């Protein structure tokens, strides 16, 4: 059913846009169920299946950025907390940084608290492909969800990424460095959080005539 699996994903897409009926108590139930089903089409391992049905999920969103944005972004936060496959969790993470500057500031503060449990688990993941796209979303997420957090929530998040400077992969060393520095542009106080990252790193190289674990010497010079 490898050619039978291709025709199933594509017919669900066109019969939502051609409804021309939104915000209906019949239309609300239909969009939750078959939206998680667009990514199982990408989770199945075939390049004829993985390439075809990922461009089809983008037809739904952009025709619905006007009409149903609060219905779109509620099904999508659920999958990160599911913490699924490294192919399933990845291509959902493109979708969520581009819709971060589409939220309203009325509903934004509930969206901030729920992500910091979800944004630390994908920092502890050793998959070198999952760690890459997060260095292209923590630029985009915490610049629009930046100003809504206090001084309590943002001190927890930066102690985690420095423990991702203690890994030996060259792909994972440069994605934890561009995450610490994109927050401090948008944290709450842009100048208060620049002085705080310089105290943490120089105790990692406090007096230089020591053994400093030469993989960890390279973690401190890329955040700078």
Q: Which residues fall within 8 angstroms of residue 89, CB to CB, at 6 or more apart?
A: 79, 80, 83, 122, 130
- Rounded to 10 degrees, what is the CA torsion of 209, 210, 213, 216? -60
- Separation CA 65–CA 186 (nearest Å): 25
User: CA angle, corner 156, sides to 154 and 159, nearest 5?
Assistant: 110
Distance between the two ends of the chain, CA-based, in angstroms?
52
- DSSP tag of 102: G
> Contact, 187 vs 153, CB < 8 A?
no
- Separation CA 76–CA 64 (nearest Å): 14
- Separation CA 178–CA 204 (nearest Å): 18
- Separation CA 121–CA 101 (nearest Å): 23
- In terms of Cα–Cα distance, which of 119, 89, 217 is closest to 165? 217
- Separation CA 197–CA 192 (nearest Å): 10
- Separation CA 164–CA 150 (nearest Å): 23
> Contact, 135 vs 174, CB < 8 A?
yes
> Contact, 154 vs 187, CB < 8 A?
yes
- DSSP tag of 86: T
């Amino acid at each position: 059913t490898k050619k039978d699996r291709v025709n199933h994903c594509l017919t669900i897409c066109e019969n939502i846009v051609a409804q021309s009926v939104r915000n209906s108590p019949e239309f609300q139930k239909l969009l939750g169920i078959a939206m998680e089903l667009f990514l199982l089409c990408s989770d199945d391992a075939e390049s004829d299946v993985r390439m075809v049905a990922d461009e089809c999920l983008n037809k739904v969103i952009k025709a619905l950025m006007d009409s149903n944005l609060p219905r779109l972004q509620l099904e999508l936060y659920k999958e990160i907390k599911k913490n699924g496959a490294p192919r399933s969790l990845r291509a959902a993470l493109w979708r969520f940084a581009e819709l971060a500057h589409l939220v309203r500031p009325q509903k934004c503060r509930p969206y901030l608290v729920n992500l910091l449990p979800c944004l630390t688990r994908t920092s502890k993941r050793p998959e070198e492909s999952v760690q890459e796209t997060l260095a292209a979303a923590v630029p985009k997420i915490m610049a629009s969800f930046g100003n809504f957090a206090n001084d309590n929530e943002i001190k927890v998040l930066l102690k985690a990424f420095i423990a991702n400077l203690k890994s030996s992969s060259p792909t994972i060393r440069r994605t934890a460095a561009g995450s610490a520095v994109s927050i401090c542009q948008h944290s709450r106080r842009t100048q208060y959080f620049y002085s705080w990252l310089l105290n943490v790193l120089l105790g990692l190289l406090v007096p230089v005539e020591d053994e400093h674990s030469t993989l960890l010497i390279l973690g401190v010079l890329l955040t700078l």
